[PDB]
A and B are shown apart, each in its own frame.
With several copies, the nearest count.
Chain A
Amino acid sequence: NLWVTVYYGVPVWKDAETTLFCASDHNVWATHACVPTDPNPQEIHLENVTEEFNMWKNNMVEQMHEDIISLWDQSLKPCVKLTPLCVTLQCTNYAPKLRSMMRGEIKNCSFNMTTELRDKKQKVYSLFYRLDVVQINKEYRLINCNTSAITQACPKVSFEPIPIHYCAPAGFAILKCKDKKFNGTGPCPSVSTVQCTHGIKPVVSTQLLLNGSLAEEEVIIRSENITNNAKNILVQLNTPVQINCTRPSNNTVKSIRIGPGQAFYYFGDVLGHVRMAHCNISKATWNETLGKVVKQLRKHFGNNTIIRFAQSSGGDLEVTTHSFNCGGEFFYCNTSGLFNSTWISDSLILPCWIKQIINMWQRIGQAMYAPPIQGVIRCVSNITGLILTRDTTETFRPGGGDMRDNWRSELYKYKVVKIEPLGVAPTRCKRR
């Protein structure tokens, strides 16, 4: 009675993992690699369509991670190598007449560096931060000399994040949840289809997520597993918290040449007074934001338990402090002043340290030397989310260091699906 009919172009799809390409409008996240941008992207709303999402199993995050690592290495490859710098340093204190917490943080290191000609050496004095220099027994060496050779970043390549748009190849589509208060997992009834995602900024930080997306209505707490305290908790804020980070000193940069066609940049001197780098967070804004986080966290853990915040318990500086790139400098800030209160049912100042030897992405065996930036650096940014870990009282601490979670906080809304435009259905026909 009924016959088989084949329909081509059927609007169905299946979950799939594929290769996405980039689009954008020197920089590490160069726009020369790809420019297939779209000034007028379209969004086709899918009515009466409910799809399941799982931000913790989303291959887009891993693919982005690899893309960032690859772009990073491509940027660093064509740059000056600093292997001649791994020498014994004769270091003394830069300014003994200091009574602030800055005293002892920067040192006067004297060393014999290679000249353009291989026959002669030059005696060079340079100023280094103590976090980059380790005592061996005066007699200091750079912290990276045992673990890895260090490469100098090219002075002409910016570290400023530029939004990157991910686009699916033909035959695939990206589903955007577009659903207020979605927790990153489970069904989403307001799914829309796009070919390209919005731009994502590859902002690198720990503990606090900067320059990200805000929650549509209220703070959203996302976790792979609430009960399992080994998972990180990603908290998306409803409003931004403005943070003003400054290095209030006028630094003078000097350079020397090491071998033919190479130049080394180093921190030369400080004009005027030497002052400590720091970040300013408004006290009331933070207190209100934290209270909102506590209320949402109590919804998961119960109205009758106490939520306590504490400073990171230990480990690498990249995970015990807040970390960010400001002006090209790498700042490490002590956040113990924020996560120091207990919740029961003016301006805050964070001191910061500057270091030039950065071991990014937790890759042991590679290191970058960040050249100093001339002048005074100030950044103003929005704190958009937190990365928290959990220990009748629940204790939470800042954490991070696994960069994938910073991207999950932005890619949770997107899923990649493959289009399979072949369907079969019964009808009443006999071919001819």
Chain B
Amino acid sequence: GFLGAAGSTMGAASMTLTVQARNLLIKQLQARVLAVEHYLRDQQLLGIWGCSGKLICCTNVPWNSSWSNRNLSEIWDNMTWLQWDKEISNYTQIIYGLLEESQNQQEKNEQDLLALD
């Protein structure tokens, strides 16, 4: 069910990411164009951050303890994604910038490793 896990905990909700992902794709044309642009913006952000065609990607940016400093198990077991997204909304623009910086550094390092031989 689309968004069926929306009220479930973050851990449980992580098991249905495919369900939401597969449903993202004159007025009808305008709406189709905007839907496509939103899809592509999300795909571009995933690519730039170093995340390939995967639902879950782990990166090299450490967690800043000032953001939602409420244990680890409490977040995944007691909260839903709507509550979590609201709690850290004010830091979203910071995290994304850090992710971009990390990937650029990682690519530079990879090229050096590729040059060694």
In the complex they form, do A and B come into direct contact, defined as C-beta atoms under 8 angstroms apart?
A: yes
Complex Cα spacing A171 to B65, Å: 32
Residues 17-51 of B contacting A (Cβ, < 8 Å): 17-21, 23-25, 27-28, 30-32, 34-35, 38-39, 42, 45-46, 49, 51
Contact B98 A4 (CB under 8 A): yes
Interface membership of A364, Cβ < 8 A: no
CB distance from B39 to the nearest CB of A (A): 7
- Please name all residues of chain A whose beta carbon is closer than 8 Å to the beta carbon of B24 when the two chains form the complex: 9, 170-171, 419, 421
The residue that B81 contacts in the complex, of A5, A11, A19, A44, with Cβ under 8 A, is A11
Complex Cα spacing A11 to B57, Å: 17
Given A4-B99, A10-B85: A170 and B59 within 8 A (CB)? no
- Please name all residues of chain A whose beta carbon is closer than 8 Å to the beta carbon of B90 when the two chains form the complex: none
Interface membership of B60, Cβ < 8 A: yes
- Please name all residues of chain B whose beta carbon is closer than 8 Å to the beta carbon of A406 when the two chains form the complex: none
Complex Cα spacing A420 to B14, Å: 15
Contact A427 B27 (CB under 8 A): no
Complex Cα spacing A49 to B1, Å: 15
Contact A423 B28 (CB under 8 A): no
Contact A425 B5 (CB under 8 A): no
Given A11-B20, A21-B28, A169-B35: A426 and B63 within 8 A (CB)? yes
Contact B7 A8 (CB under 8 A): no
- Please name all residues of chain A whose beta carbon is closer than 8 Å to the beta carbon of B62 when the two chains form the complex: 1-4
Contact A3 B30 (CB under 8 A): no
Residues 67-106 of chain B: 1 if any A CB is under 8 Å from the residue's CB, otherwise 0?
A: 0110010011000111011001000100100110000000
Contact B7 A19 (CB under 8 A): no
The residue that B7 contacts in the complex, of A18, A48, A430, with Cβ under 8 A, is A48
Contact B38 A7 (CB under 8 A): no
Interface membership of A6, Cβ < 8 A: yes
Interface size class on chain B is 35 or more
Contact A2 B2 (CB under 8 A): no
Closest B residue by C-beta to A194? B2
Complex Cα spacing A42 to B1, Å: 9
Closest A residue by C-beta to B50? A431
Given A425-B10, A432-B114: A19 and B21 within 8 A (CB)? no
- Please name all residues of chain A whose beta carbon is closer than 8 Å to the beta carbon of B2 when the two chains form the complex: 44, 173, 193, 195
Residues 410-430 of A contacting B (Cβ, < 8 Å): 418-430
- Please name all residues of chain A whose beta carbon is closer than 8 Å to the beta carbon of B72 when the two chains form the complex: 2, 426-428
Contact A12 B82 (CB under 8 A): yes
The residue that B58 contacts in the complex, of A1, A12, A431, with Cβ under 8 A, is A431
Interface membership of A46, Cβ < 8 A: yes
Contact A173 B3 (CB under 8 A): yes
Contact B51 A8 (CB under 8 A): yes
Contact B7 A47 (CB under 8 A): yes
- Please name all residues of chain A whose beta carbon is closer than 8 Å to the beta carbon of B27 when the two chains form the complex: 19, 21
- Please name all residues of chain B whose beta carbon is closer than 8 Å to the beta carbon of A422 when the two chains form the complex: 42, 45-46
- Please name all residues of chain A whose beta carbon is closer than 8 Å to the beta carbon of B39 when the two chains form the complex: 170-171
- Please name all residues of chain A whose beta carbon is closer than 8 Å to the beta carbon of B76 when the two chains form the complex: 425
The residue that A8 contacts in the complex, of B1, B31, B46, with Cβ under 8 A, is B46
Contact B1 A429 (CB under 8 A): no
Given A2-B72, A429-B111: A19 and B18 within 8 A (CB)? no
Contact B60 A171 (CB under 8 A): no
CB distance from A21 to the nearest CB of B (A): 5
Closest B residue by C-beta to A195? B2
Complex Cα spacing A432 to B110, Å: 10
Closest A residue by C-beta to B63? A2
Closest A residue by C-beta to B92? A424
* Contact sample, A vs B, 20 pairs, CB 8 Å cutoff: A5-B111, A6-B46, A6-B51, A6-B59, A7-B14, A8-B17, A8-B46, A8-B57, A9-B20, A11-B3, A11-B5, A12-B6, A47-B8, A49-B82, A170-B25, A171-B34, A172-B35, A419-B20, A426-B68, A432-B58
A residues adjacent to B (C-beta < 8 A): 1-13, 18-21, 34, 42, 44-49, 169-173, 193, 195, 418-432
